[PDB]
Amino acid sequence: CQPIFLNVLEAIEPGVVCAGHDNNQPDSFAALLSSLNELGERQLVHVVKWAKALPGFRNLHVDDQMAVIQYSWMGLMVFAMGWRSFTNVNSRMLYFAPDLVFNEYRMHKSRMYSQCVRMRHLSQEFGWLQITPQEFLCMKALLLFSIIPVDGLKNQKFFDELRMNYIKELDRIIACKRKNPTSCSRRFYQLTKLLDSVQPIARELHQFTFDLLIKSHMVSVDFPEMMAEIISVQVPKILSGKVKPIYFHT
Ligand SMILES: C[C@]1(O)CC[C@H]2[C@@H]3CCC4=CC(=O)CCC4=C3C=C[C@@]21C
């Protein structure tokens, strides 16, 4: 029951990343979405660096390393975002960045109102569930290993070993605080269900961004190339079902 794994996750947790949005200019659909894309791009860099420092991660095949990242990035972003929205604005608003927060007016002006409401649900679960900052970190890590191609990775064996241990860490951080037996058996059920909620949501964001990408040109929203590239190559595989989420309760 020693904190070594937790020290690592807290040690690697990324810092405050600013979107670089002009909060002194009147709201707009394209200015809100272009900023979200620039924010996406910069948070990807962090995710890249955050992931490569994970216990066991660097033993995975290079492409597999690069793959689970691209496939799971949206869900990590949504999940982290929902956490910031819980600890910073008590879930009523979406804390994408300190300088890019969505009040209800923006959720609508940006035209992601329905997805926004879905993400706000998520941010609200943290509250109703009483997620400890430790359960959070463990879950955010596990998410990375939550979405894989339908055959497998070019060495599925290790991924599956990595995935199994992270589950154990999550199990550890539950049994290493309060009650036992029925209390933590159900506390585990609850979190895995919570983990599962991220996928549908991430799915929706995937659909939207892809659509936003093909429309981009004629609707003046800008996409940073690294991201534009991931949306156009890796995202289609998810929307088409060639890469699928791994649920706990399927
Ligand atoms: C606007 C859009 O293209 C569609 C959905 C958007 C996603 C929604 C989820 C999200 C959460 C964050 O905390 C980082 C920014 C972020 C996004 C940035 C750009 C995207 C991909």
CSV table of C-alpha atoms and ligand atoms in Angstrom, one decimal:
chain,number,residue,atom,x,y,z
A,1,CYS,CA,0.0,0.0,0.0
A,2,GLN,CA,3.0,2.4,-0.6
A,3,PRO,CA,2.5,5.7,-2.7
A,4,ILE,CA,5.2,5.1,-5.4
A,5,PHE,CA,2.8,4.9,-8.4
A,6,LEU,CA,0.8,7.9,-7.1
A,7,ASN,CA,4.0,10.0,-6.7
A,8,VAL,CA,4.7,9.4,-10.3
A,9,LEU,CA,1.3,10.4,-11.6
A,10,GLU,CA,1.3,13.5,-9.4
A,11,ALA,CA,4.8,14.2,-10.4
A,12,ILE,CA,4.0,14.0,-14.2
A,13,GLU,CA,0.5,15.7,-14.1
A,14,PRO,CA,0.7,18.5,-16.7
A,15,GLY,CA,0.5,22.2,-15.7
A,16,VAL,CA,-1.8,25.1,-16.5
A,17,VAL,CA,-1.9,25.4,-20.3
A,18,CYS,CA,-3.3,28.8,-21.7
A,19,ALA,CA,-5.4,28.8,-24.9
A,20,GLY,CA,-4.4,32.3,-25.8
A,21,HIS,CA,-7.9,33.6,-26.4
A,22,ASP,CA,-8.9,37.3,-26.6
A,23,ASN,CA,-11.3,37.8,-23.7
A,24,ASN,CA,-11.7,41.5,-24.7
A,25,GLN,CA,-13.2,40.8,-28.1
A,26,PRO,CA,-16.9,40.1,-28.6
A,27,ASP,CA,-17.7,36.4,-28.7
A,28,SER,CA,-18.0,34.6,-32.0
A,29,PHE,CA,-18.5,31.1,-33.3
A,30,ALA,CA,-15.3,30.9,-35.4
A,31,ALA,CA,-13.1,32.7,-32.8
A,32,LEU,CA,-14.3,30.4,-30.0
A,33,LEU,CA,-13.8,27.2,-32.1
A,34,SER,CA,-10.3,28.3,-33.5
A,35,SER,CA,-9.1,29.0,-30.0
A,36,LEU,CA,-10.4,25.6,-28.8
A,37,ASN,CA,-8.3,24.1,-31.7
A,38,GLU,CA,-5.2,26.0,-30.8
A,39,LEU,CA,-5.8,24.9,-27.2
A,40,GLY,CA,-6.2,21.3,-28.4
A,41,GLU,CA,-2.9,21.5,-30.3
A,42,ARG,CA,-1.0,22.7,-27.2
A,43,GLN,CA,-2.6,20.2,-24.9
A,44,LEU,CA,-1.5,17.5,-27.2
A,45,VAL,CA,2.1,18.4,-26.8
A,46,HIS,CA,1.6,17.9,-23.0
A,47,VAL,CA,-0.2,14.7,-23.4
A,48,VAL,CA,2.6,13.5,-25.6
A,49,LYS,CA,5.2,14.4,-23.0
A,50,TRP,CA,2.9,13.3,-20.1
A,51,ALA,CA,2.3,9.8,-21.5
A,52,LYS,CA,6.0,9.0,-22.5
A,53,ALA,CA,6.8,9.4,-18.8
A,54,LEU,CA,4.2,6.8,-17.6
A,55,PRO,CA,5.3,3.7,-15.8
A,56,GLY,CA,5.7,1.1,-18.4
A,57,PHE,CA,4.6,3.2,-21.3
A,58,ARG,CA,8.0,3.4,-23.0
A,59,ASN,CA,8.2,-0.4,-23.3
A,60,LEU,CA,5.3,-0.4,-25.8
A,61,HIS,CA,6.1,-0.4,-29.5
A,62,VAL,CA,6.8,3.1,-30.9
A,63,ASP,CA,3.9,3.1,-33.2
A,64,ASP,CA,1.7,1.6,-30.5
A,65,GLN,CA,3.0,4.4,-28.3
A,66,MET,CA,2.0,7.0,-31.0
A,67,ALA,CA,-1.3,5.2,-31.6
A,68,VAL,CA,-2.9,4.9,-28.2
A,69,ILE,CA,-2.0,8.6,-27.8
A,70,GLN,CA,-3.7,9.8,-31.0
A,71,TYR,CA,-6.8,7.5,-30.3
A,72,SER,CA,-7.2,8.4,-26.7
A,73,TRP,CA,-6.3,12.1,-26.7
A,74,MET,CA,-9.9,13.5,-26.9
A,75,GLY,CA,-11.0,11.4,-23.9
A,76,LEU,CA,-8.0,12.5,-21.8
A,77,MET,CA,-8.7,16.1,-22.7
A,78,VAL,CA,-12.4,15.8,-21.9
A,79,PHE,CA,-11.7,14.0,-18.7
A,80,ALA,CA,-9.0,16.5,-17.5
A,81,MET,CA,-11.2,19.4,-18.6
A,82,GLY,CA,-14.1,18.0,-16.6
A,83,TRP,CA,-11.8,17.8,-13.6
A,84,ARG,CA,-10.6,21.5,-13.9
A,85,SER,CA,-14.3,22.4,-14.3
A,86,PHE,CA,-15.0,20.6,-11.0
A,87,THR,CA,-12.3,22.1,-8.9
A,88,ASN,CA,-12.3,25.6,-10.4
A,89,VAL,CA,-16.0,26.6,-11.3
A,90,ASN,CA,-18.1,24.0,-9.4
A,91,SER,CA,-19.2,22.3,-12.8
A,92,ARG,CA,-21.5,25.1,-14.0
A,93,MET,CA,-19.0,26.2,-16.6
A,94,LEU,CA,-16.4,24.5,-18.8
A,95,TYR,CA,-12.8,25.4,-17.8
A,96,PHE,CA,-11.1,24.5,-21.0
A,97,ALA,CA,-8.3,27.0,-20.1
A,98,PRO,CA,-7.9,29.9,-17.6
A,99,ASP,CA,-8.5,32.3,-20.5
A,100,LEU,CA,-11.1,30.1,-22.3
A,101,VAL,CA,-14.0,29.3,-20.1
A,102,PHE,CA,-17.5,28.5,-21.4
A,103,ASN,CA,-20.3,30.2,-19.7
A,104,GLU,CA,-23.7,29.2,-21.1
A,105,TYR,CA,-23.6,32.0,-23.7
A,106,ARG,CA,-20.4,30.6,-25.2
A,107,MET,CA,-21.5,26.9,-25.2
A,108,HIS,CA,-24.2,28.3,-27.5
A,109,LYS,CA,-22.3,30.9,-29.5
A,110,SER,CA,-19.6,28.2,-30.3
A,111,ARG,CA,-22.4,25.8,-31.4
A,112,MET,CA,-21.2,22.8,-29.3
A,113,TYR,CA,-24.0,23.4,-26.8
A,114,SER,CA,-25.1,19.7,-26.8
A,115,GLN,CA,-21.7,18.3,-26.4
A,116,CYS,CA,-20.9,21.0,-23.9
A,117,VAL,CA,-23.9,19.9,-21.8
A,118,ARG,CA,-22.6,16.3,-22.0
A,119,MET,CA,-19.2,17.2,-20.8
A,120,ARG,CA,-20.8,19.3,-18.0
A,121,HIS,CA,-22.6,16.1,-16.9
A,122,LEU,CA,-19.1,14.4,-16.6
A,123,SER,CA,-17.7,17.4,-14.7
A,124,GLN,CA,-20.7,17.1,-12.4
A,125,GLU,CA,-20.2,13.3,-11.7
A,126,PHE,CA,-16.9,14.1,-10.0
A,127,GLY,CA,-18.9,16.0,-7.5
A,128,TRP,CA,-21.7,13.5,-6.9
A,129,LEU,CA,-19.2,10.7,-6.8
A,130,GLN,CA,-16.7,12.5,-4.4
A,131,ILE,CA,-13.7,11.5,-6.6
A,132,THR,CA,-10.5,11.8,-4.6
A,133,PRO,CA,-7.6,13.6,-6.5
A,134,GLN,CA,-5.9,10.2,-6.4
A,135,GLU,CA,-8.7,8.2,-8.0
A,136,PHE,CA,-8.7,10.9,-10.6
A,137,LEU,CA,-5.1,10.6,-11.5
A,138,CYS,CA,-5.3,6.8,-11.7
A,139,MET,CA,-8.3,7.0,-13.9
A,140,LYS,CA,-6.8,9.6,-16.2
A,141,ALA,CA,-3.9,7.3,-16.7
A,142,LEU,CA,-6.1,4.2,-17.4
A,143,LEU,CA,-8.0,6.2,-20.1
A,144,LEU,CA,-4.8,6.2,-22.2
A,145,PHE,CA,-5.2,2.4,-22.5
A,146,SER,CA,-8.9,2.6,-23.2
A,147,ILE,CA,-9.1,2.8,-27.0
A,148,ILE,CA,-7.4,0.3,-29.4
A,149,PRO,CA,-7.7,-0.8,-33.1
A,150,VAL,CA,-10.0,-3.9,-33.6
A,151,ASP,CA,-7.2,-6.5,-34.3
A,152,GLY,CA,-4.8,-5.1,-31.8
A,153,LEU,CA,-1.6,-3.2,-31.6
A,154,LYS,CA,1.6,-4.4,-33.3
A,155,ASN,CA,2.3,-6.1,-29.9
A,156,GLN,CA,-1.0,-6.4,-28.0
A,157,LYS,CA,0.6,-8.6,-25.3
A,158,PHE,CA,2.5,-5.9,-23.4
A,159,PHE,CA,-0.4,-3.3,-23.8
A,160,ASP,CA,-2.6,-5.9,-22.1
A,161,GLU,CA,-0.1,-6.3,-19.3
A,162,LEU,CA,0.2,-2.6,-18.9
A,163,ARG,CA,-3.5,-2.2,-18.9
A,164,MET,CA,-4.0,-4.9,-16.2
A,165,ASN,CA,-1.5,-3.3,-13.8
A,166,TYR,CA,-3.1,0.2,-14.1
A,167,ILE,CA,-6.4,-1.5,-13.1
A,168,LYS,CA,-4.6,-2.9,-10.1
A,169,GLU,CA,-3.3,0.6,-9.2
A,170,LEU,CA,-6.8,1.9,-9.4
A,171,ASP,CA,-7.9,-0.9,-7.1
A,172,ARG,CA,-5.0,-0.1,-4.7
A,173,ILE,CA,-5.9,3.6,-4.4
A,174,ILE,CA,-9.5,2.6,-3.5
A,175,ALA,CA,-8.7,0.0,-0.7
A,176,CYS,CA,-6.0,2.2,0.6
A,177,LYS,CA,-8.2,5.0,2.2
A,178,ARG,CA,-11.6,4.2,3.9
A,179,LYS,CA,-14.0,1.1,4.2
A,180,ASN,CA,-14.1,-2.6,3.3
A,181,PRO,CA,-15.7,-5.2,2.0
A,182,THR,CA,-19.0,-4.1,0.1
A,183,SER,CA,-18.0,-0.4,0.3
A,184,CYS,CA,-14.9,-0.6,-2.0
A,185,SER,CA,-16.3,-3.5,-4.3
A,186,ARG,CA,-19.1,-1.0,-5.2
A,187,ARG,CA,-16.7,2.0,-5.1
A,188,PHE,CA,-14.8,0.1,-7.9
A,189,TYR,CA,-18.0,-0.5,-9.9
A,190,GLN,CA,-18.8,3.2,-9.7
A,191,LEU,CA,-15.5,4.4,-11.1
A,192,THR,CA,-15.3,1.9,-13.9
A,193,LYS,CA,-18.8,3.0,-14.9
A,194,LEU,CA,-17.5,6.6,-14.7
A,195,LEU,CA,-14.6,5.6,-16.9
A,196,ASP,CA,-17.0,4.1,-19.4
A,197,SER,CA,-19.1,7.5,-19.6
A,198,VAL,CA,-16.1,9.2,-21.2
A,199,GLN,CA,-16.1,7.1,-24.3
A,200,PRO,CA,-19.7,8.0,-25.6
A,201,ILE,CA,-18.8,11.6,-24.9
A,202,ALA,CA,-15.4,11.4,-26.6
A,203,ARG,CA,-17.2,9.7,-29.5
A,204,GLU,CA,-19.5,12.7,-29.9
A,205,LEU,CA,-16.6,15.1,-29.8
A,206,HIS,CA,-14.9,13.1,-32.5
A,207,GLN,CA,-17.9,13.3,-34.8
A,208,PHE,CA,-18.2,17.0,-34.3
A,209,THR,CA,-14.6,17.9,-34.8
A,210,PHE,CA,-14.3,15.7,-37.9
A,211,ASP,CA,-17.4,17.5,-39.3
A,212,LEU,CA,-15.9,20.8,-38.2
A,213,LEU,CA,-12.8,19.9,-40.1
A,214,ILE,CA,-14.4,19.1,-43.4
A,215,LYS,CA,-16.5,22.3,-43.0
A,216,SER,CA,-13.6,24.4,-41.8
A,217,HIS,CA,-12.5,26.0,-45.1
A,218,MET,CA,-15.9,27.6,-45.9
A,219,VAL,CA,-16.7,28.5,-42.2
A,220,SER,CA,-13.3,30.1,-41.3
A,221,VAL,CA,-12.4,28.0,-38.2
A,222,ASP,CA,-8.6,27.3,-38.1
A,223,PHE,CA,-7.0,23.9,-37.4
A,224,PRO,CA,-3.3,23.6,-36.3
A,225,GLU,CA,-1.7,21.1,-38.7
A,226,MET,CA,-0.6,18.5,-36.2
A,227,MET,CA,-4.2,18.3,-35.1
A,228,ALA,CA,-5.8,18.7,-38.5
A,229,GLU,CA,-3.7,15.7,-39.4
A,230,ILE,CA,-4.9,13.6,-36.5
A,231,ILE,CA,-8.5,14.5,-37.2
A,232,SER,CA,-8.2,13.5,-40.9
A,233,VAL,CA,-6.4,10.1,-40.4
A,234,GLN,CA,-6.9,8.7,-37.0
A,235,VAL,CA,-10.3,10.0,-36.2
A,236,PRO,CA,-12.0,8.4,-39.3
A,237,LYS,CA,-10.9,5.0,-38.0
A,238,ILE,CA,-12.8,5.6,-34.8
A,239,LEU,CA,-16.0,6.9,-36.4
A,240,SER,CA,-15.9,3.9,-38.8
A,241,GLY,CA,-15.4,1.4,-36.0
A,242,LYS,CA,-11.9,0.1,-36.9
A,243,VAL,CA,-10.6,1.4,-33.5
A,244,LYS,CA,-13.0,0.8,-30.6
A,245,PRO,CA,-13.1,1.7,-26.9
A,246,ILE,CA,-12.6,-1.1,-24.3
A,247,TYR,CA,-15.4,-1.0,-21.8
A,248,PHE,CA,-15.5,-2.5,-18.3
A,249,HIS,CA,-19.2,-3.3,-18.5
A,250,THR,CA,-19.7,-4.3,-22.2
B,1,LIG,C1,-13.5,22.4,-31.1
B,1,LIG,C2,-13.0,21.0,-31.5
B,1,LIG,O1,-12.5,21.0,-32.8
B,1,LIG,C3,-14.1,20.0,-31.4
B,1,LIG,C4,-14.1,19.4,-30.0
B,1,LIG,C5,-13.0,20.2,-29.3
B,1,LIG,C6,-12.3,19.6,-28.1
B,1,LIG,C7,-13.4,19.4,-27.0
B,1,LIG,C8,-12.7,18.8,-25.8
B,1,LIG,C9,-11.5,19.7,-25.3
B,1,LIG,C10,-11.2,19.6,-24.0
B,1,LIG,C11,-10.1,20.4,-23.5
B,1,LIG,O2,-9.9,20.7,-22.3
B,1,LIG,C12,-9.0,20.7,-24.5
B,1,LIG,C13,-9.7,21.4,-25.7
B,1,LIG,C14,-10.8,20.5,-26.3
B,1,LIG,C15,-11.2,20.5,-27.6
B,1,LIG,C16,-10.5,21.4,-28.6
B,1,LIG,C17,-10.9,21.3,-29.9
B,1,LIG,C18,-12.0,20.5,-30.4
B,1,LIG,C19,-11.4,19.1,-30.9
